Design a protein around this ligand. Structure first.
Ligand SMILES: *C1=[C@](F)([C]N2[C]([C][N]C3=[C][C]=C(C(=O)[N][C]([C][C]C([O])=O)C([O])=O)[C]=[C]3)[C][N]C3=C2C(=O)[N]C([N])=N3)C(=O)[N]C(=O)N1[C]1[C][C]([O])[C]([C]OP([O])([O])=O)O1
Length: 279
C-alpha cells in the first residue's frame, strides 16, 4: 500500500528469519524495567529508497509524528542538547539518558550548533554553512553534516544513531541521503525515516529546490527480542494510503518553522503498539 510500509515490513521479516542473535555477548543495552541485558536479532547494511511521491510514514501502527518533528527541531533548529528544552515541548523520549546537567553531552544539537566553519570572515555552524552552500554552491560534493565528532565522542551521553547526511543538488532537485550506524527498527526507525524526510522538505522549501530522492541507509539493523511479538502483529495488519504533509508555504527562513507549521492530512493508521525501550 505504501512505500515505507512495504520496505519496512520486508526488512523486519528478514531480521526475524535470518537475523543474528547477540545473546552470547555482553551487550551495552539493558531493559528499562527489569534492567536485564537487552539483546537483539540483526542484519547489516540495509537501505530504503523513496522518490518523495509519498510521505514516508508507517500506517500499520500509530506513529507519534508530532513528537518526531519536535525532536528534529530540537536538534537541527534549536541546536540544543538540553533535554529540558525538549520536556518543555512535551517530549520525554530522551529523559532516560539525560545527564546530571540536564543535557545529553556534547552531542546532537551541540554539534550542529558549534561555530567551526569559516564562511565570509566569520564562523558559522554546520547548519548555516550547509544552507549557504546549497544555494551558492549546489554542485559541491561536500554537502555533509556530521554528528559523529571523533574528538568529543567521550563527552556524549549517547553517540548518535543517525549521525550523518549528504545532500545533492542535481537537476534543480535536492536529494538527501542519511545514514544510521545503529537502528532500533521498532522504536527509532519509524521516527528517523519520517523526521528526516521532513527535514528534506524544509530545507528544500527555504532553498528553492524541487524534491529529489530520499535514501535511508542503516548499518546495524536490529530488532530487540521483546519486540518480535508486536512486530509480527504489526506486519500482518493492513495499510492505508500515505497521508499528505502540509508545510506552511509562508515560511521562507529555516529558523521560522514551528511545530504548528506541519499538518498530516488523512493519516489513517492501525492501533498504537507498545515497545519497551532498551537503555
Ligand atoms: C538511536 C536514536 F538516537 C533514538 N533513540 C533515542 C531516544 N529516542 C526514542 C526513545 C523512545 C521512543 C518511544 O518510546 N516511541 C514511542 C512514542 C510515544 C510518545 O509519544 O512518547 C512509540 O511507541 O513509538 C522513541 C524515540 C536514544 N536511545 C534509544 C533510541 C531508540 O530508538 N531505541 C533505543 N533502544 N534507545 C535514533 O535516532 N535511532 C535509533 O534507532 N537508535 C537506537 C539504535 C540502538 O538500538 C540504540 C542505541 O544503542 P547503541 O548500542 O547502538 O549505541 O538506539
Amino acid at each position: 500500500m505504501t512505500q515505507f510500509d512495504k520496505q519496512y515490513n520486508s526488512i523486519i521479516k528478514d531480521i526475524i528469519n535470518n537475523g543474528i542473535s547477540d545473546e552470547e555477548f555482553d551487550v551495552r543495552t539493558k531493559w528499562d524495567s527489569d534492567g536485564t541485558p537487552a539483546h537483539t536479532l540483526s542484519v547489516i547494511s540495509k537501505q530504503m529508497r523513496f522518490d518523495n511521491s509519498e510521505v514516508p510514514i508507517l500506517t500499520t501502527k500509530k506513529v507519534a509524528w508530532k513528537t518526531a518533528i519536535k525532536e528534529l527541531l530540537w536538534i537541527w533548529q534549536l541546536k540544543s542538547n538540553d533535554v529540558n528544552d525538549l520536556n518543555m515541548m512535551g517530549v520525554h523520549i530522551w529523559d532516560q539518558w539525560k545527564q546530571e546537567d540536564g543535557t545529553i553531552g556534547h552531542a546532537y544539537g551541540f554539534q550542529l550548533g558549534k561555530k567551526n566553519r569559516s564562511l565570509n570572515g566569520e564562523k558559522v555552524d554546520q547548519v548555516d554553512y550547509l544552507l549557504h552552500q546549497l544555494k551558492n554552491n549546489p554542485s559541491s560534493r561536500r554537502h555533509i553534516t556530521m554528528l559523529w565528532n571523533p574528538d568529543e565522542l567521550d563527552a556524549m551521553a549517547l553517540t548518535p544513531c543517525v549521525y550523518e547526511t549528504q545532500w545533492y543538488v542535481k537537476h534543480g532537485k535536492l536529494h538527501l541521503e542519511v545514514r544510521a550506524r545503529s537502528n532500533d527498527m521498532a522504536l527509532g526507525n519509524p521516527f528517523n525515516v519520517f523526521q528526516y524526510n521532513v527535514l528534506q522538505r524544509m530545507i528544500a522549501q527555504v532553498t528553492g529546490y524541487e524534491l529529489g530522492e530520499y535514501i535511508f541507509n542503516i548499518g546495524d539493523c536490529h530488532v530487540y527480542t521483546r519486540h518480535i511479538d508486536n512486530l509480527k502483529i504489526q506486519m500482518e495488519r493492513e495499510q492505508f494510503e500515505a497521508p499528505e504533509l502540509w508545510i506552511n508555504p509562508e515560511v521562507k527562513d529555516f529558523y521560522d518553522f514551528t511545530i504548528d507549521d506541519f499538518k498530516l492530512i488523512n493519516y489513517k493508521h492501525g492501533d498504537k503498539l507498545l515497545f519497551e525501550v532498551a537503555v
